[PDB]
From a paper:
Amyloid-forming proteins such α-synuclein and tau, which are implicated in Alzheimer’s and Parkinson’s disease, can form different fibril structures or strains with distinct toxic properties, seeding activities and pathology. Here we report that O-[name] modification of α-synuclein monomers results in the formation of amyloid fibril with distinct core structure, as revealed by cryogenic electron microscopy, and diminished seeding activity in seeding-based neuronal and rodent models of Parkinson’s disease. Our results show that posttranslational modifications, such as O-[name] modification, of α-synuclein are key determinants of α-synuclein amyloid strains and pathogenicity.
We focused on O-[name] modification at S87, termed α-syn(gS87), because this modification site displays the least inhibition of α-syn fibril formation, thus providing an opportunity to obtain homogeneously O-[name]-modified fibrils for detailed analysis. We subjected α-syn(gS87) to aggregation and used TEM and cryo-EM to visualize fibrils, revealing various fibril morphologies, including double, triple and quadruple filaments comprised of two, three and four protofilaments, respectively. The most abundant species was the double filament, which had a diameter of approximately 20 nm. Due to the limited number of segments present in the triple and quadruple filament morphologies, we only performed three-dimensional (3D) reconstruction with the double filaments. The 3D classification resulted in one main class with two protofilaments seemingly related by a twofold axis. The resulting density map, with a resolution of 4.97 Å, corresponded to a crossover of 1,221 Å, an optimized twist angle of −0.7° (assumed to be left handed), and a helical rise of 4.92 Å. Modeling structures at this limited resolution cannot necessarily define molecular features, but the density map could fit a reasonable α-syn(gS87) model comprising the residues from glycine 7 to lysine 96 and an extra density corresponding to the sugar on serine 87. This analysis shows several salt bridges potentially holding together the two protofilaments (sb1) and contributing to the folding of the α-syn(gS87) fiber structure (sb2, sb3 and sb4). The electron density confirms that α-syn(gS87) fibrils are quite different from both the pathogenic unmodified fibrils we prepared here and the amyloids isolated from patient brains to date, and our structural model potentially explains how O-[name] statically forces a different fold. In the full-length fibrils, O-[name] is stable against removal by OGA.
Numbering used by the authors:
A (entry chain C), B (entry chain A), C (entry chain B), D (entry chain H), E (entry chain G), F (entry chain F): 1 to 96
Write the structure that this text describes.
Amino acid sequence: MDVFMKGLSKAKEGVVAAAEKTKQGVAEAAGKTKEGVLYVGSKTKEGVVHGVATVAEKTKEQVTNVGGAVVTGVTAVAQKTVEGAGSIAAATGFVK
Amino acid sequence: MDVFMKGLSKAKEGVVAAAEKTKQGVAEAAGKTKEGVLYVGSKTKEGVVHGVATVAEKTKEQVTNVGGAVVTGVTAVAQKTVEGAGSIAAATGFVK
Amino acid sequence: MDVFMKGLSKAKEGVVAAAEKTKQGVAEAAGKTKEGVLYVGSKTKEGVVHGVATVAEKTKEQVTNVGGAVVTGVTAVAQKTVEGAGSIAAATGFVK
Amino acid sequence: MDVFMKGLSKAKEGVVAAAEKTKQGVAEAAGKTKEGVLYVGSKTKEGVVHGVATVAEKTKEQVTNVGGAVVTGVTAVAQKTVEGAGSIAAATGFVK
Amino acid sequence: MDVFMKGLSKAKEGVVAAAEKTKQGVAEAAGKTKEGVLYVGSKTKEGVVHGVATVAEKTKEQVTNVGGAVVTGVTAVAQKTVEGAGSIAAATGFVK
Amino acid sequence: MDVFMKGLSKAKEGVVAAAEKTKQGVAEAAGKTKEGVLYVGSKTKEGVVHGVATVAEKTKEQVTNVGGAVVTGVTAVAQKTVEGAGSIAAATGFVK
Ligand SMILES: *[C@@H]1O[C@H](CO)[C@@H](O)[C@H](O)[C@H]1NC(C)=O
Ligand SMILES: *[C@@H]1O[C@H](CO)[C@@H](O)[C@H](O)[C@H]1NC(C)=O
Ligand SMILES: *[C@@H]1O[C@H](CO)[C@@H](O)[C@H](O)[C@H]1NC(C)=O
Ligand SMILES: *[C@@H]1O[C@H](CO)[C@@H](O)[C@H](O)[C@H]1NC(C)=O
Ligand SMILES: *[C@@H]1O[C@H](CO)[C@@H](O)[C@H](O)[C@H]1NC(C)=O
Ligand SMILES: *[C@@H]1O[C@H](CO)[C@@H](O)[C@H](O)[C@H]1NC(C)=O
């Protein structure tokens, strides 16, 4: 009995790394439990409406680089070691 | 019995790293439990409406670099070690 | 019985690192428990409306660098070690 | 040699009647005459851009009439007579 | 040699009647004459940009009439007579 | 040689009637004459930018009439007669 959007339950030694560049309209998390209930002579209505995110959106990204090195975007790195060596490189630029 | 958006439950030795550049309209977290209830002769209405995020949004990013190195964006790094060595590099620029 | 937006429950030795550049319309956290209740001859209405974030937003970022190194954005780093050495570098610029 | 948007030229005994409920983006009137001109070694650019009128427009008109007579809209009437009689009726409501 | 938006030229005995409920973004009137000109070694740029009128406009008109007569809108009437009789009625309501 | 927005030129016995309920962003009237000019080694830029009228405008008109007669809007009437009779009625309400 549990509901998650991005989580974890009943875990040992957890390592989590995350990153987002998102535009979410509705990220609603709902747990609806309905037990032991009676409806003699009744009208019931439940709803979730218009989960729109964006309209008429204009986005422009221009990158002009001459003899250089730039980093743009989203990056996530996670690493665990009991013993040893971990050599990890992401989005690196070496210029000579 | 629990609801999460981005969390964790019943965990030992947890390491979490996160980062966002988001534009969320509605991030509502709801737990609706309904037990032991009667509705003789009644009208019930429940709703969540218009979870819009943005309209008519204009975003522009211009990067002009000459002989350099710049860092833009979102980055998250998490690392755990019992014993040993961890060499991790992200979004690095070496120029000579 | 609990609801979280970004939190954690019943954990030992927790390390959390986070950072945001967000524009959230509604980040409401709601726990609605309804037990032992009667509605003979009644009208009930519950709602959450118009969770809009932004309209007509204009954002511009211009970066012009000549022979340099600048850092822009959101970065989060978390690291835990029992014994050993951790060498972590993020968004670094070396120029000679 | 002349340019008009809604006008008249070299006329005798003119009668004009007009009415609008318009939403025009660009109603620009341009007369561009280019004579006796030289362009040795040159770059020339001329332009008209983004003549947008409206975005994300919401318009609602509700008319609820019980046993009545209402007038809505745009009406234009023009009449000329040398001799005689002119009987003209527009958008009339007779109730008994 | 002349430019008009809504006018008249070289006319005798003119009668004009007009009425508007407009929302114009740009109603610019331009006369550009370019004669006897030289451009050795030059760059020329001419432009008109972003003639937008409206964004995110919300307009609502509700008319609720019971046993009556109302007049809404734009009306223009023009009439000329040398001799005689002119009977003109517009947007009239007779109730008995 | 002349530019008009709403006017008249070289006319005899003119009758004009007008009325507006407008919201104009830019109603600029420009006459640009360029003759006898030289541009050796030069850069020329001319422009008109951002003729926006309105953003995020909300307008509401509610008319509730019971057994009456009201007049709303814009009306313009013009009439000329050499000899005779002119009977003109606009937006009239007769109740008995
Ligand atoms: C780890 O990675 C680095 C570069 O990030 C590399 O030079 C090295 O050899 C790797 N190994 C160890 C044991 O450091
Ligand atoms: C760790 O990473 C660095 C660079 O970040 C590298 O020079 C080194 O060799 C790696 N290993 C150790 C044991 O330091
Ligand atoms: C740790 O990282 C640094 C650079 O941040 C590196 O020079 C070094 O070798 C790494 N290891 C140790 C044990 O310091
Ligand atoms: C003119 O029109 C009216 C109604 O508008 C009508 O009663 C009449 O007979 C018409 N003729 C004359 C000559 O008035
Ligand atoms: C003119 O119009 C009126 C109503 O507006 C009408 O009663 C009349 O007969 C018409 N003619 C003359 C000559 O008045
Ligand atoms: C003029 O119009 C009126 C009403 O406005 C009408 O009663 C009349 O008969 C018309 N004619 C003359 C000659 O007055």
